[PDB]
Amino acid sequence: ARVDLETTRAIAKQMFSSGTVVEVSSDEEGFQGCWFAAKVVEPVGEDKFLVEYRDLREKDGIEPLKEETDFLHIRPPPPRDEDIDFAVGDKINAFYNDGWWVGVVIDGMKHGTVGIYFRQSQEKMRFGRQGLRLHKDWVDGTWQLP
Numbered sequence: 001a002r003v004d005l006e007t008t009r010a011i012a013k014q015m016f017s018s019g020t021v022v023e024v025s026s027d028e029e030g031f032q033g034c035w036f037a038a039k040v041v042e043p044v045g046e047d048k049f050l051v052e053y054r055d056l057r058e059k060d061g062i063e064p065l066k067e068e069t070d071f072l073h074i075r076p077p078p079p080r081d082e083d084i085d086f087a088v089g090d091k092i093n094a095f096y097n098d099g100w101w102v103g104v105v106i107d108g109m110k111h112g113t114v115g116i117y118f119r120q121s122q123e124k125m126r127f128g129r130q131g132l133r134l135h136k137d138w139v140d141g142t143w144q145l146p
Contacts, residue, residue, distance in 0.1 A: 003072075003139050009047065011141040012071035014087035016049055018042050023100070024051055025073045033102030033120065035075070035093065047071055055098040084134055086114050091135040091146050094118075094127050102135060 016022055037054035044050050048070050057063040068135040086092065086105045094099040094116055106124065107115025113126040136143050 007140045009071050012049075012074060013043070013046070015076060016040050016043065016071075016074055021054075021077060022049075022051065023075050023077055024052065024053075024067075024069045025075075027073070030120065035100040036098065037077070037100075038069075040074075041066065044068055078133070078136045079140070079145060080133060084128075086132065086134075092116065093133050093135050094146055095131045096127075100133070 014127070018040055020040045022038055022040060024038045025031070025035055036056055038051040038056075039054065041050040048068050050066065050068055051074070053065040053067070058065055064110050086109060088105055088108060092105055092114075093103075094102050094103050096135060101118060101120070102109070103112055103116045103118045106117045106122040107126075109129060112129050114129060114132055116127045117124045134145070136145060
């Protein structure tokens with residue numbers, strides 16, 4: 001409980017209409033702390049939205065994945081601020097495997113790459129700068145830093 005259900009539902013109803021570009025998350029195992037790009041096909045009921053993924057595909061690998069998601073797992077695309085230089089300890093998102101995955105900066109930028117660690121995979125690697133962003137949370141219609 002660090003978001004308010006009433007407000008979140010209202011804001012989601014307001015902003016996520018047909019055609020709206022969004023990010024959606026999943027409760028499925030191994031997908032905690034990941035945001036996928038998508039677009040609202042249409043709202044469903046009062047709490048849900050049919051979305052079509054920008055990058056994720058159906059099993060043939062060709063047709064865009066389509067799924068229902070609820071108002072607690074959908075958000076707008078965050079502002080990108082690319083004036084940013086990452087510092088060690090910064091909570092970030094890194095784009096790979098078709099998604100924005102939560103990670104932590106473990107080494108400052110060198111030669112256009114940043115050292116990154118992912119807690120989910122317990123894996124460490126260097127990422128190209130333009131595949132990284134500062135992590136932000138969508139709360140009650142407002143973008144906030146951690």
